[PDB]
């Protein structure tokens, strides 16, 4: 279940690394992280539900919030190809 998280304009690449390091500390159930350069200040999180996203986004810098709703996978392929 893909979710989209909003970050600051110029530090999405660093926030991806921050999430990738954070997931190990409590062994979060996050499957993959996608931060394309075609969207500014937005990253894509693969999570079973919203609660794990909220827990994994608590203390990471430059992250403000996660957009409500589950963005369809059908609107993502032409970004990851």
């Amino acid at each position: 279940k893909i979710f989209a998280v909003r970050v600051t304009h110029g530090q999405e690449e660093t926030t991806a690394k921050l999430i990738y390091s954070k997931v190990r500390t409590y062994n979060l159930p996050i499957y993959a992280i996608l931060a394309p350069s075609r969207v500014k200040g937005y990253i894509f999180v693969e999570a079973p539900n919203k609660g794990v996203v909220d827990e994994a986004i608590r203390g990471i810098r430059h992250a403000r919030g996660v957009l409500p709703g589950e963005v369809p996978f059908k609107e993502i392929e032409h970004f990851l190809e």
Partner: peptide, 19 residues
Amino acid sequence: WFDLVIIVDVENSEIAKKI
């Protein structure tokens, strides 16, 4: 690598299965 994608577990992440 202008783009960036990471995967935690291939066994479960369906993006890795897609690619």
